[PDB]
């Protein structure tokens, strides 16, 4: 079966909310036993728009990760209904509720591929992963590594971003009781983003180093691409130059200051003498 | 609703302990929990002048716009403020200036509860344009 019609995967805010909400609805499982559900969305496009998700009851044990239940029958019956809603809604792939992928996920993937025409395994997390994306999208690939590993079926990442639809986007604002200090439209928002940026870089940066250690000892298989990309980052380095700002901002501001002060200087004598007569008047006026 | 509103009542007369409660209730899910988080500090302090409480109620309401929290926040100030009735309009005038029925709703209420006994001229006057308005 094809996994083809993807080069990008955008995911709606609807997708995430549906999984936390659905956890209570089914059984109040709460990621005690990981859930896999259908991932619904558009087709006949290069880009993948994941419009929607619904849960399927799938419990995978915590004794063992090779045993699971996946409710097949629900998938065929839910199929006919999707057209009643809209004819752009078809089964694109499946969702994993995290916290992480498994080797076991290849086997879960073969069953789901029969239904889909463009299966993808997108891990939508029940916990939001950081302030970054709470979603990572992956696609099943047959590849060899020059680590002395013959043919494996594994998950290589494909770029994930968050998108929205015209109907949905409006609805999100109304619902929200946050105002956004992280809007990123203007200078005020932009300065916050820079502080956070540094913190983001640090969180990402640690992982890269532990991965390098694992290969060294605490043996882990080398994904060749990762090592190739790492070395590239260090070589571009140059040193800094210039950039500065003018005295001009102040000049304008001072201009405003003169105008008021001149108006004040004529007004002063008038305003200050009169005060005593009005003051007396006020106290008596107040009583009645 | 019955239980969120009850937390305030049991907590009556301990004063400072209540401070802890407003923040935690707000941290919990639904808008209902957050609402009655505003009532606890106010019931507890009951006619004692406390700086910290008024600041928090005000900041929560402005910072995060939610219908339940903004109405409840304003209403609470009238109880802390109860002991001296004249001080109250000057604080409350700023919430009345904000265009939003829920914010207006508490701002009006706050003047009635505080000024209830010994009143003041200014308090009564502020209420009248809101009465006149077509927004129910």
């Amino acid at each position: 079966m094809p996994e083809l019609a993807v080069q990008k995967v955008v995911v709606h805010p609807l997708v995430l909310l549906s999984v936390v909400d659905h956890f209570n609805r089914i059984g109040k499982v709460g990621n005690q036993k990981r859930v896999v559900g259908v991932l619904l969305g558009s087709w006949q496009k290069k880009v993948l728009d994941v419009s929607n998700s619904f849960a399927v009851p799938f419990d995978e044990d915590d004794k063992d990760d090779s045993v699971w239940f996946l409710d097949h029958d629900y998938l065929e019956n839910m199929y006919g209904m999707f057209k009643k809603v809209n004819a752009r809604e078809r089964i694109v792939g499946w969702y994993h509720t995290g916290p992480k992928l498994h080797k076991n996920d290849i086997a879960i993937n073969e069953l789901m591929k029969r239904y889909c025409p463009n299966s993808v395994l997108v891990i939508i997390d029940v916990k939001p992963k950081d302030l970054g994306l709470p979603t990572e999208a992956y696609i099943s690939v047959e590849e060899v590594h020059d680590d002395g590993t013959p043919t494996s079926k594994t998950f290589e990442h494909v770029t994930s971003e968050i998108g929205a639809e015209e109907a949905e986007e409006v609805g999100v604002e109304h619902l929200l009781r946050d105002i956004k200090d992280t809007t990123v439209g203007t200078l005020s928002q932009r300065i916050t983003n820079q502080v956070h940026g540094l913190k983001g870089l640090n969180s990402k940066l640690l992982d890269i180093r532990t991965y390098l250690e694992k290969v060294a000892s605490g043996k882990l298989p080398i994904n060749h691409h990762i090592i190739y990309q790492l070395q590239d980052v260090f070589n571009l380095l140059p040193d800094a130059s210039l950039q500065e700002f003018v005295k001009a901002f102040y000049l304008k501001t001072n201009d405003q200051m003169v105008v008021v002060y001149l108006a004040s200087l004529i007004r002063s004598v008038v305003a200050l003498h009169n005060l005593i007569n009005n003051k007396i008047a006020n106290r008596d006026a107040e009583k009645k | 609703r019955g239980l969120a509103v009850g937390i305030a009542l049991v907590m009556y007369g301990r004063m400072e302990e209540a401070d802890a409660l407003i923040e935690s209730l707000c941290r919990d899910k639904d808008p209902i929990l957050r609402r009655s988080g505003m009532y606890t500090v106010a019931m507890a302090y009951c006619g004692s002048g406390n700086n910290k409480a008024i600041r928090r109620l005000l900041h929560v309401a402005v910072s995060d716009v939610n219908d339940d929290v903004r109405r409840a926040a304003v209403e609470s100030l009238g109880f802390i403020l109860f002991r001296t009735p004249e001080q109250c309009p000057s604080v409350v005038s700023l919430l009345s200036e904000s265009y939003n029925p829920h914010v207006r709703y508490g701002a009006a209420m706050a003047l009635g509860v505080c000024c209830a006994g010994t009143g003041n001229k200014e308090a009564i006057n502020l209420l009248e344009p809101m009465t006149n308005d077509p927004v129910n």
């Binding site: 604002e173 105002i179 956004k180 928002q189 | 402005v62 700023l94």
Partner: protein, 60 residues
């Protein structure tokens, strides 16, 4: 009031974004016929309907 003013700055942007949707397309083309006021104005459209319209602050 100090922290409040900062808060209010964030609201202006939020608001600006929301309105922006309304502001864009569907957009019809008129000719600017005449001004009744500088808050509401009269503009005449190209199917012939004359309109009493509000001026949205995002221009002069």
């Amino acid at each position: 009031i100090k922290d409040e003013q900062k808060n209010l700055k964030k609201e202006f942007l939020h608001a600006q974004e929301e309105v922006k949707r309304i502001q864009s397309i569907p957009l019809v083309i008129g000719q600017f016929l005449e001004a009744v006021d500088q808050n509401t104005a009269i503009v005449g459209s190209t199917t012939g309907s004359n309109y009493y319209v509000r001026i949205l602050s995002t221009i002069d």
